[PDB]
Design a protein around this ligand. Sequence first.
Ligand code: 580
Length: 301
Amino acid sequence: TIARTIVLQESIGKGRFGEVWRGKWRGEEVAVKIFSSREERSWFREAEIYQTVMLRHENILGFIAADNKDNGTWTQLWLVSDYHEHGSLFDYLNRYTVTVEGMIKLALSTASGLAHLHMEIVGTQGKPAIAHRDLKSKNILVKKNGTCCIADLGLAVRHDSATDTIDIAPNHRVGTKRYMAPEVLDDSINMKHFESFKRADIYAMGLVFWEIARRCSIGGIHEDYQLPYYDLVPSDPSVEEMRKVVCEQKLRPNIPNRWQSCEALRVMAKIMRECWYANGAARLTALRIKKTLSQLSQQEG
Ligand SMILES: Cc1cccc(-c2nn3c(c2-c2ccc(F)cc2)CCC3)n1
C-alpha cells in the first residue's frame, strides 16, 4: 500500500549501498532508498535495525517503512523515510557557514542521536544498545530547524545485554576508511566487546565535530569546508594510508589555536581531543558529550 502510492521525483542519493530518491506520498515529500533484489541482505538488515528496535528519536532519521515493492519483472526493495531538503551535514557544511548557535545545535543533536543509539533500555519493551559503525558527515542529515538526525544504520550492531552477545550484521563491506577508529585501522579492536564499537563511534563523531567547528563563522573568519585529514591523505584513502597517519604518526585533524578565543569553540575543541585518544577506554561517552553540550547550550540561549 505504501510503496505503490509513492511517486519518485529525483535522485538525491549516493551510490555505495543502494540509491536514494526524493518522493511524493499523499502530498508529502518523502525519501526512498531503493535496493535491487540482489542487494537484498543489506536491505533487510537496515530495515531490521530501524524496526526491531524502539529507535524513535528526533535525532535519528524518521523511518517510515520497508516494502518489498514487487514488480512482476524485477521486484525492488524500498526503504522509506522522512525527507530532508538540506541533505547531508556534509552538503550543509559545504554550502553554508554557521553561527556559534548553529554549531551547538548541530553538535548537540548529533550527540543526542548517538547517545540514544548507544543507550540500552533493559526489560519488557526495552531498546538494545546499538553501535553505528559508519558515522560520518554524509550519514547525518540536517533538518529544516537546524538540527541533525543520524542516518544509514545498515552496518549497526545491536547488543544483547542478556546473553552479552552481539547481533552481527549480514553484509560484505565495513565502514568508511577515513573515519575508521585507530583500533579498527590497525585491526586491534576486540570485535567481541560491544563497548569497543561505541568507543569507535565517539572517535568518528569527534571528526564530525571538527568539520562543523571549522565552519563556525565569527567576525567573518572561518576556514573552508574540509574532510578530516584532508591535509594528510588522498581522496578515497586506503586502510594502509589512514593507519600510517593515524596510528604510526599518531596524527589527528588540526585544531586552530584561534578556537580558544571563543568559549564554545574551546568546549568543542576539548571534546574533540577527548574523542581522539588512541585508547578507546579514555574517550568520552556520547551521553557525557550531550550533557556538556547541553550545559553550553543553556548558557548561549
Ligand atoms: C532508512 C532510509 C530511507 C530513505 C533514505 C535513507 C538515507 N540513507 N542515507 C541517506 C539517506 C537520505 C535520507 C533523507 C533524504 F532526504 C536524503 C537521503 C544519506 C546517506 C545514507 N535512509
